[PDB]
Design a protein around this ligand. Structure first.
Ligand SMILES: [Zn+2]
Ligand SMILES: [Zn+2]
Ligand SMILES: [Zn+2]
Length: 229
């Protein structure tokens, strides 16, 4: 069994790796232990060549070397590695691994988001608010949790960007699950937005995972913005 955040972060990681036909992550407890996929991820999201590393790290010393290379790169970019060391990754500390991946999502997916001079999380929230301004009172984006669980904010974002793809006014606003599914399907099929979260992970969830939602909503910002150039 894997948590929403585990699954969402794994899917995010894989969208990056697949951009270079690299092998996927299936289990974050085990699949980062030799340091290779972490290094490759960093090259991809960081747009840099990290140079040579151990490509057959059969011995523990070489896995630690690989992971240490990754962590040093992350530190060199000014990201906090609060209370994580190479052995935490080699030995599959899932809590610390998810923490690290969030640090990377925040830096490489969210930090550069900008709306009205606000950046990062604030910027992304404000973008959502501005883009859904015409959908009050039923849509009211106030956070990256409860504001998203009825499906309508996702549908409104799609509709305002491409009113030909999703007829918002024809939705049965009470069918949260059908509307969520519709948005996720249209986003993926027509807008190229990867399905980082399952409908059941957010639809009518009392305490949805904030970081997972943020990770997925950031895909809307980047795709919409790029497509609107
Ligand atoms: Zn747009
Ligand atoms: Zn509650
Ligand atoms: Zn969270």
């Amino acid at each position: 069994w894997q948590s929403v955040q585990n699954r969402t972060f794994t899917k995010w990681f894989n969208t990056k790796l697949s951009s270079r036909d690299l092998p996927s992550v299936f289990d974050l407890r085990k699949d980062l232990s030799d340091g290779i996929l972490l290094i490759q991820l960093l090259e991809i999201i960081g747009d840099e060549n990290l140079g040579r590393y151990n490509r057959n790290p059969r011995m523990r010393v070489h896995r630690l070397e690989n992971v240490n290379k990754a962590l040093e790169y992350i530190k060199s970019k000014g990201m906090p590695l609060t209370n994580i060391g190479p052995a935490d990754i080699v030995d599959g500390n899932l809590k610390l691994i998810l923490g690290l991946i969030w640090t990377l999502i925040l830096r490489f997916t969210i930090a550069d988001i900008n709306e009205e001079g606000l950046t990062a999380k604030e910027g992304l929230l404000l973008w959502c608010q501005r883009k859904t301004a015409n959908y009050h009172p039923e849509v009211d984006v106030q956070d990256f949790t409860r504001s998203w669980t009825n499906g309508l904010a996702f549908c409104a974002l799609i509709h305002q960007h491409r009113p030909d793809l999703l007829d918002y006014n024809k939705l049965d606003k009470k069918n949260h699950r059908a509307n969520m599914q519709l948005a996720f399907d249209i986003a993926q099929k027509s807008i190229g937005i990867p399905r980082l979260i399952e409908v059941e992970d957010v639809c009518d969830v009392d305490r949805p995972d904030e970081r997972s939602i943020m990770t997925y909503v950031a895909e809307y910002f980047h795709a919409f913005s790029t497509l609107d150039k």
